[PDB]
């Protein structure tokens, strides 16, 4: 009941409920030893939507993300987007010439260059299963 | 040892044009470099389409893994 | 002059060095393909002329000197990277 | 012996010789016996009462003179005295602002991972009371989301001592980071954008970032060049090491029987 209703308030843009259920269920947070969420998850209260928008949209104007994050200011919304790309939350870029915030490029060389860098571990893990099988085989 | 002959034929063609660029023996104008003039144009390594040879490398890898 | 380093020659270099007009560089290279001293191809949206060349002739001792340096780079690439393969796969060689 | 507990503390300390007397006071206390076991014995805790107090006023005189390796030196030994295993040790009334000096210093030099793991030893003083500690953790919360300006509008409110020798460094390491964002491909603006983004309708700060940074004022137009690299690629570079990996595949198939 605390944690399911916690992420209930996180997904919506409501902070008054977020502060209410902190006050309601803080003593349960005392038993779990997790006081520190209130100081470090209020960061992601504003950063969850900008992760959600930049995954949905592809080439957005900063004048429209202000009302969509209900921040009512385009001038600091540059800085929230600047902090998220600084933290590597979204890989996107900003056009600071006429107000464009565009996302990344298309699906990349993922079909060509990547998959052997997953395949090397799976060779090495499965033959070690074959090695650990054969070495521990014959006790009689 | 297939590649140990690749430098062995290379060290022989190394020694020949050292002693004819030096200029000891007369330059065979007919075949000794005119056939090499044909040779020295075709190690084509043009990248950005031959880079896309390597999902077939992933394909040859995929059956192994 | 450029030995297949970037042999995709642009049209203005031919039109200047042959001092021919721009519209006649295509009829000039189709003649050289018709004779058979070159086996390239022609792009026209970029107007760059791709080159594959099989006609040999004399090469005037100074170009052996540059051919030596390219053969010496060719030497240490073959030699050292064979020592990499042999030292790596020594125990399954026999 | 028992050297000037409030000698030149209250009015002024322009001293350099009492700094040597404090230097000798360090040679007195830390050569008495030790402070390592600390089993019981309030009588041998009595010099531990004074050893805290002389390092508190040593940390007071350190920030009075702005010595950076010394200030972490006195504070670590003070934190080692709150690392006492048998802490009877009545509450010195300077502790909360002393840790607030440490909380603000370690915030300023970009020890942000060390910042939050420092906050574990504070049970409930962050919420109930203690504006000496509540102010830098409200400051770090302002650095969290997007709120640069609430930091600089709470600049004119320190309930503690002046804190100026830390917050001059703390804001300078903010200004160059936003300068580090604007020294990217963001090409040209005017002084009024340096007034809005950076701050400060004209002081000599526009001279400060003309000489430190670039930002030459042209025909009422600044200039910042492109910091974007060329990205040299071949993407057949791993041809050696991929040829290495397949060798130990068959080497681990054969040869180990």
DSSP per-residue string spanning D49-112: HHHHHHHHHHHHHHHHHT-HHHHHHHHHHHHHHSS-SS------TTHHHHHHHHHHHHHHTT-H
Q: Is D133 exposed, middle or buried (0-12, 13-18, 19+ CB in 10 A)?
A: buried
Q: How far is residue D239 CA from its own chain's centroid? A: 46
Experimental method: cryo-EM
CB A53 within 8 A of CB A27: no
3-state SS assignment for residue A93: strand
CA D29 to chain centre: 29
The C-alpha atoms of residue D124 and residue D142 are separated, in whole angstroms, by 20
Angle made by CA atoms A118, A119, A124, in degrees to the nearest 5: 110
Beta-sheet strand order (sheet of C9-10): C9-10, C48-50, C41-42
- Name every residue whose Cβ is closer than 8 Å to that of residue D156 and which is 6 or more positions away in sequence: none
| Contacts made by residues D47-52, CB under 8 angstroms, sequence distance 24+ | D48/D81, D48/D84, D48/D89, D49/D89, D49/D90, D50/D2, D50/D5, D51/D81, D52/D78, D52/D81, D52/D89, D52/D92
- 3-state per-residue secondary structure call for D171-224: HHHHHHHHHHHHCCCCCCCCHHHHHHHHCCCCCCHHHHHHHCCCCCCCCCCCCC
The set of chains that have 3 or more CB pairs under 8 A with D is A, B, C
Q: Which positions ≥6 away from A33 have C-beta within 8 Å?
A: none
For residues A92 and A52, is the Cβ–Cβ distance under 8 A?
A: no
Question: What distance separates the 2 farthest-apart alpha carbons in chain B?
Answer: 57
Closest by Cβ to A112, choosing from B54, B64, B65: B54
CB neighbourhood size of A21 (10 A): 16
Chains touching chain B, criterion 3+ CB pairs below 8 Å: A, C, D
Contact (CB, 8 A) for D190 and D222: yes
Nearest-CB residue to A79 (from D140, D148, D235): D148
C chain contacts of residue B21, beta-carbon cutoff 8 Å: 61, 64-65, 68
At C48, give phi and psi (nearest 5°). -95, 140
What b/e sequence results for D200-211 when a residue is b if at least 16 CB atoms lie within 10 Å of its CB, and e otherwise?
eeeeeebeebee
Q: Nearest 5°: CA angle at A12, between A7 and A17?
A: 75
Nearest C-alpha of chain C: how many angstroms from B34?
6
* CB contact (8 A) between residue D247 and residue C89: yes
Using CA coordinates, name the residue in chain D closest to B58: D242
**Backbone phi, psi, residue A95, to 5°:** -100, 105
Distance, in Å, from the CA atom of A105 to the CA atom of A44, rounded to the nearest integer, reads 25
- Residues of chain D neighbouring A40 (CB-CB closer than 8 A): 116, 144
Distance CA D228, CA D214 (A): 16
Mutation test of the interface with chain A: which of B53, B55, B62, choosing the one with the most A Cβ atoms within 10 A? B55
What's the Cα-to-Cα distance from B39 to each of A90, B2, C54, D34, rounded to whole Å?
52, 20, 8, 85
Chain B nearest C-alpha distance from A108 (Å) = 12
Rounded Cα–Cα distance for residues C78 and C70 (Å): 13
Helical (H) or strand (E) element with A61 = strand A59-61
Q: Which residue in C54, C68, C78 is closest to B17 by CB distance? A: C68
Which residue is closest to C64 within chain B, CA to CA?
A: B21
Helix axes D239-251, C62-88, angle to 10 degrees: 30
Is B55 within 8 Å of A112 when comparing Cβ atoms?
yes
Cα D168 to the chain's mean position, in Å?
A: 11
Q: Using CA atoms in the order B29, B34, B40, B42, what is the torsion angle rounded to 10 degrees?
A: 180
Looking up tokens 């190690």, which residue turns up? Answer: B43
**For residue A59, what are the β-bridge partners?**
A102
Q: Resolution of the coordinates in A?
A: 3.2
Rg (CA), chain D: 27
- In this complex, the residue of C3, C58, C82 whose CB is nearest that of residue B41 is C3
β-partners of residue A95 are A100
Inter-chain residue contact D243 with C85, CB threshold 8 Å: yes
CB atoms within 10 A of CB D155: 11
Q: Using CB atoms, which residue from B21, B33, B44 is nearest to C68? A: B21
Contacts 24+ apart (CB under 8 A), C71-75: C71/B10, C71/B13, C71/B14, C71/B17, C72/B14, C74/B10, C75/B7, C75/B10, C75/B11, C75/B14
- For tokens 């660029």, the residue is B21
- Other CB atoms within a 10 A radius of the CB of residue C46 amount to 9
Which chain D positions have a beta carbon within 8 Å of B51's beta carbon? 235-236
Q: Contacts of residue A130 in chain B, CB cutoff 8 Å?
A: none
CA dihedral D58, D61, D67, D72 (to 10 degrees): 30
Helix or strand holding residue A60 (H, E): strand A59-61
CA angle D193, D194, D196 (to 5 degrees): 60
Q: How far apart are CA D1 and CA B19, in angstroms?
A: 93
Q: What DSSP element (H or E) covers C47?
A: none
Helices (H), chain A: 2-11, 16-32, 37-40, 42-56, 62-68, 74-86, 116-135
Residues with Cβ within 8 Å of D188's Cβ and at least 6 positions away in sequence, in order, are D221, D222, D223, D224
């Amino acid at each position: 009941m605390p944690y399911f209703l916690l992420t209930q308030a996180v997904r919506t843009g409501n902070l008054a409920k977020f502060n209410q259920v902190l006050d309601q269920f803080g003593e349960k947070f005392q038993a779990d030893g997790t006081y520190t969420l209130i100081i470090r998850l209020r960061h992601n209260v504003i950063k969850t939507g900008v992760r959600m928008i930049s995954l949905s949209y592809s080439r957005i104007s900063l004048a429209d993300i202000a009302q969509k994050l209900q921040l009512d200011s385009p001038e600091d919304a540059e800085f929230i987007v600047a902090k998220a790309i600084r933290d590597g939350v979204i890989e996107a870029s900003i056009n600071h010439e006429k107000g464009y915030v565009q996302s990344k490029e298309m699906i990349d060389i993922y079909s060509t260059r990547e998959p052997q860098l997953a395949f090397h571990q799976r060779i090495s893990f499965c033959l070690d299963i074959h090695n650990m099988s054969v070495k521990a085989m014959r006790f009689p | 040892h297939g590649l140990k002959g690749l430098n062995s034929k290379l060290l022989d063609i190394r020694s020949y044009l050292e002693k004819v660029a030096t200029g000891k023996l007369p330059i065979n104008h007919q075949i000794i470099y005119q056939l090499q003039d044909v040779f020295n144009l075709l190690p084509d390594v043009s990248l950005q389409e031959f880079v896309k040879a390597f999902y077939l490398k992933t394909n040859d890898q995929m059956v192994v893994v | 002059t450029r030995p297949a380093n970037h042999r995709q020659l642009t049209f203005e270099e031919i039109a200047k060095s042959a001092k021919i007009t721009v519209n006649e560089v295509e009829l000039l290279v189709m003649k050289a393909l018709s004779v058979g001293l070159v086996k390239g191809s022609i792009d026209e949206v970029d107007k760059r002329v791709h080159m594959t060349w099989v006609q040999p002739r004399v090469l005037d001792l100074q170009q052996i000197k540059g051919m030596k340096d390219r053969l010496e780079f060719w030497c240490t690439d073959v030699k050292s990277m064979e020592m990499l393969v042999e030292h790596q796969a020594h125990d399954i060689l026999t | 012996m028992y050297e000037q507990l409030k000698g030149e503390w209250n009015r002024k300390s322009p001293n350099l010789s009492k700094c040597g007397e404090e230097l000798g006071r360090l040679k007195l206390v830390l050569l008495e016996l030790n402070f390592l076991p600390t089993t019981g014995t309030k009588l041998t805790k009595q010099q531990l009462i004074l050893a805290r107090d002389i390092l508190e006023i040593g940390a007071q005189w350190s920030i009075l003179r702005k010595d950076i390796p010394s200030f972490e030196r006195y504070m670590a030994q003070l934190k080692c005295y709150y690392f006492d295993y048998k802490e009877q040790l009545p509450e010195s009334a300077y502790m909360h602002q002393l840790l607030g000096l440490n909380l603000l210093f370690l915030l300023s030099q970009n020890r942000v991972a060390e910042f939050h793991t420092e906050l574990e030893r504070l049970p409930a003083k962050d919420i109930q009371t203690n504006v000496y500690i509540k102010h830098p953790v409200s400051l770090e919360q302002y650095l969290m989301e997007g709120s640069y300006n609430k930091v600089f509008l709470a600049k004119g409110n320190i309930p503690a001592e002046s804190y100026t020798f830390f917050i001059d460094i703390l804001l300078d390491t903010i200004r160059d980071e936003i300068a580090g964002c604007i020294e990217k491909a963001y090409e040209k603006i005017l002084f009024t954008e340096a007034t809005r983004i950076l701050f400060f309708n004209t002081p000599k700060k526009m001279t400060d970032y003309a000489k430190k940074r670039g930002w030459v004022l042209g025909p009422n137009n600044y200039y910042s060049f492109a910091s974007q690299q060329q990205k040299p690629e071949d993407t057949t570079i791993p041809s050696t090491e991929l040829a290495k990996q397949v060798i130990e595949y068959a080497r681990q198939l054969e040869m180990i029987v």
